[PDB]
C-alpha cells in the first residue's frame, strides 16, 4: 500500500534534541518491518513494554509517535509509566498507557571533543506538578511569585538552564545516551499502520 517506513532516518540523525525541547515526529501510513531493527548491534536497551516485538508486525495502529532525546546514564531507568526522579517527574513524564519501546543507545564514540558541551541542557528547575506533557521552550527564570527577581546577578533566584558536562575522560554511569521512544495511541479513527502480514 505504502513505501518503507522512514524509521531508518530516525535512528540515524545528525543532531538530536534536548530534554526541554524534544522531537515529537508523528509516523503513520507506513510498514512495520522490524526485521532489520531486531538484528541490530548489541545495544544496552531493547525493551518494549506494550507487546512482543515479534507479534508487533501483525498489529494495526492508527498513528504512532517517535520522540528522540539525549540523557545521561543514571537517567535511563527513570523512563517508565510512573516513577520518581529528577527527569521522570520534572521534565519528561509519561502517563500510564505507554505501549511502545524504550530503545536507546550510547553514542560516546564520535563526540570525543574536549571543548565544552554547552549545547544540551535539561532545565533542572521547574514547577510542573500535573499534565505529564508539560513541556517548556521559553527562557524565563526560576520563580514562584512573591516579588520575583528582575536582574541578572540574582543571589535569590537562578537561571534555570543547567547544561551538561559530557567529557570523554569519564567513566560509566555518567555517559551520554540517545533515547528514542515510540508512543502509541488509538482513537475513533481507522488504522493506518499494520505491518507486513
Amino acid at each position, epitope marked *: 500500500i*505504502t*513505501n*518503507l*517506513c*522512514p524509521f*531508518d*532516518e530516525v535512528f540515524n*540523525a*545528525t*543532531r*538530536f*534534541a534536548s530534554v526541554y*525541547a524534544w*522531537n*515529537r*515526529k*508523528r*509516523i*503513520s*501510513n*507506513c510498514v512495520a518491518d522490524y526485521s532489520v531493527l531486531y538484528n541490530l548491534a548489541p545495544f544496552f536497551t531493547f525493551k518494549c513494554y506494550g507487546v512482543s516485538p515479534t507479534k508487533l508486525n501483525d498489529l494495526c495502529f492508527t*498513528n504512532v509517535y517517535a520522540d528522540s532525546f539525549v540523557i545521561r546514564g543514571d537517567e535511563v531507568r527513570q523512563i517508565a509509566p510512573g516513577q520518581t526522579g529528577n527527569i521522570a517527574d520534572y521534565n519528561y513524564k509519561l502517563p500510564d498507557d505507554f505501549t511502545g519501546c524504550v530503545i536507546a543507545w550510547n553514542s560516546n564514540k564520535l563526540d570525543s571533543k574536549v571543548s565544552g558541551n554547552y549545547n544540551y541542557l535539561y532545565r533542572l528547575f521547574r514547577k510542573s506538578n500535573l*499534565k505529564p*506533557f*508539560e*513541556r*517548556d*521552550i*521559553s527562557t*524565563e527564570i526560576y520563580q514562584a511569585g512573591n516579588k520575583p527577581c528582575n536582574g541578572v546577578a540574582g543571589f535569590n533566584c537562578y537561571f534555570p538552564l543547567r547544561s551538561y558536562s559530557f567529557r570523554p575522560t569519564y567513566g560509566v554511569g555518567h555517559q551520554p545516551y540517545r533515547v528514542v521512544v515510540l508512543s502509541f495511541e488509538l482513537l475513533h479513527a481507522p488504522a493506518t499502520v499494520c505491518g507486513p502480514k
Partner: antibody
Amino acid sequence: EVQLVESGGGLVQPGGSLRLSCAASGFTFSSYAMNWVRQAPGKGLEWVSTISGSGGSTYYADSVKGRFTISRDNSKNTLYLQMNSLRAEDTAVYYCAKDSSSWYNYYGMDVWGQGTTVTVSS
Amino acid sequence: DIVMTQPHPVSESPGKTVTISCTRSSGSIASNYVQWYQQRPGSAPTTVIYEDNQRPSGVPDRFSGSIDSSSNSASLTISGLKTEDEADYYCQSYDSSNHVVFGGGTKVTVLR
C-alpha cells in the same frame, strides 16, 4: 530561492480529480518535510496536510481526511497532491511550504512559494 | 486542537513600535515554539524568524519574538515602522498531534 510552477486552477464539478505539482529548485532538497496549506478567500490560513522528507511519513488534517493524498519524488524532487471528490469548502488558494533541516520536523519553515487558486462551483 | 484566536487588525503612526499578541485557544502554551509570518495583500507570506529566535533571512532588527507565561501568549514586537509593514500577519504553531495550527490574522496599517 525556490521556484514553484503548477498546471492551473481550473474549476471542476463536485466529485472530480485534481493533481497539483510543486516541483522546486535549489541544491538542498534531500530530506525536508513538505506541508500543503490552504487559505480560503476572506479567511486566514488553514493547514491541509504534510509529508516527511524521505517520502515515507505522510498525513492530513481532520476535515480533509479520506479524500486527499500527497506524495514526494526525490531524484526529480516534486510534491504531488491528489484531490478527489471536492466540496464547496475546497475553493481556496493552496501553497506548498518547506521546513528546516531533517532533525526537527515541527520546528522551522523556509520560503513557501506561489500557490494557486482552486475553485469548486456548480 | 482549536484555532488560536488572533486579535483585531491594528493601525499605528510611523516612527513608533507596535506589539502584536497571539493567545492560545485551548490548553496551555507549554508546547513547541510559536512563529510568525508576514503576508502582504496579494503576495506570498514571508517568515520573520529563520529557525527559532535569532537573525532571520533579511530582517535585521525590526521583528522580535517573546513568550509571556503570565498572560500565556506570544508577543511580536515590530520596531521601526516602514511602508512595507502594512500587511497581514499570522501566528503559526504546532499542537500535540503534529498538526499545523494558524491564527485569525491581524492587519498592521501605517498612517500616511
